[PDB]
Amino acid sequence: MQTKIQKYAGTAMPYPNRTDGMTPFYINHLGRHGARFPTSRKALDKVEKVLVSAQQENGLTSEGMALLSMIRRLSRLFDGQWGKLSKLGETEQEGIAGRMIRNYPQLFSNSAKIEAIATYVPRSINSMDAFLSCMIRHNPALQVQRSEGKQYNHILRFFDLNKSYVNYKEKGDWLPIYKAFVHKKISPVPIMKKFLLNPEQYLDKEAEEFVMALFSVAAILPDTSIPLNLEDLFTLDEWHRYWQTQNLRQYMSKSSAPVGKMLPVAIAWPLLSEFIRSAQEVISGKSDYQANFRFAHAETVIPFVSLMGIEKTDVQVCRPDSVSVYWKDYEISPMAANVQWLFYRDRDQRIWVKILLNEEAAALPISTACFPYYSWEKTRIFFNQRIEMAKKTLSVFN
């Protein structure tokens, strides 16, 4: 239902459009913050610098002059706004919250209790608040515990706390593979021709950096609620190629790529452990929360989803050029990406669990006679094995 052009924004794609009587007794949630502003001015500055230099040397086409003017505008509009949750992101959360309460009103009825946590990052806290405000508007009699901060780094920001992973992310063996893939997929000259006279005068490296920075600026704009669009700076095929390179970057640096040896995935086990613990506590009656919500990041969601072993999000593809066929970032971690575990009790008091990834039922590599419902016992056992495997992985890269 999403357009190809939307998809090619990858993890910058805005949350997609989501507009049997089974009623769950508990929901276990993890969501990325909603649509945000760019976090860094680096790409913008790079584009501006190249254009200003060309302008001083009379090297701009008319379209280039136009682009420069537009780039200066964005610089003004982004000023002081870096990394913030946009109006669109607030509305994404309201929609997710709203569909949840509409789908399962009994769960949030009367004096139901919910807890929410977030990282210390403002856009995640603001996302939590957009979400909680909706819940409370629908049922003010909810009891709500709201907390956030670095105390949750171990479960929400594990990607900052593992030294081996940090090193891998910064300078691991995925880097040269990514760089060569970009060199193969991205042809800067046709693009820069649009904006600059004598584009063939540019060194391949400066030309590539310019084009890559430009894609980055274009890709984030639909997340900002600013009524400006730059999708037409590039052809559909150029977007497709850009998307392939960034998709590979995400897969290799944050997911199940063989070059990563599952290190990027294994680091998420504390969050999977926490999910199981909170569900177990509700199930036993030690806790009587109706839902636990958690607000964090793409860097939280991607490895978490792979560690769960959902669908083929943990596929290990040897061939870089085959990755995009089997693993798609925009399907896993768009803006506002979320995972929900819905728990049910049947008439025989047996506990079942449904996993939703971006509000669509997800499959696990275990059997069930009633998909999309899985036996909680089987599921927990499976997840506990994933955690054990994760610890084993980390013990080798310690």
Author numbering: 20 to 38, 46 to 424
Question: Can you provide the manuscript's text about this entry?
Answer:
We determined that prominent gut bacteria express homologs of the mammalian InsP6 phosphatase (MINPP) and characterized the enzyme from Bacteroides thetaiotaomicron (BtMinpp). The Vmax value for InsP6 (178 μmol/mg/min) is the highest yet reported for any member of the MINPP family, being several orders of magnitude greater than that for the human (0.006 μmol/mg/min) and avian (0.7 μmol/mg/min) representatives (Ali et al., 1995, Cho et al., 2006). BtMinpp folds into two domains, an α/β domain and an α domain. The active site in BtMinpp is lined with predominantly basic amino acids, thereby rationalizing how the enzyme can bind unusually highly phosphorylated substrates such as InsP6.
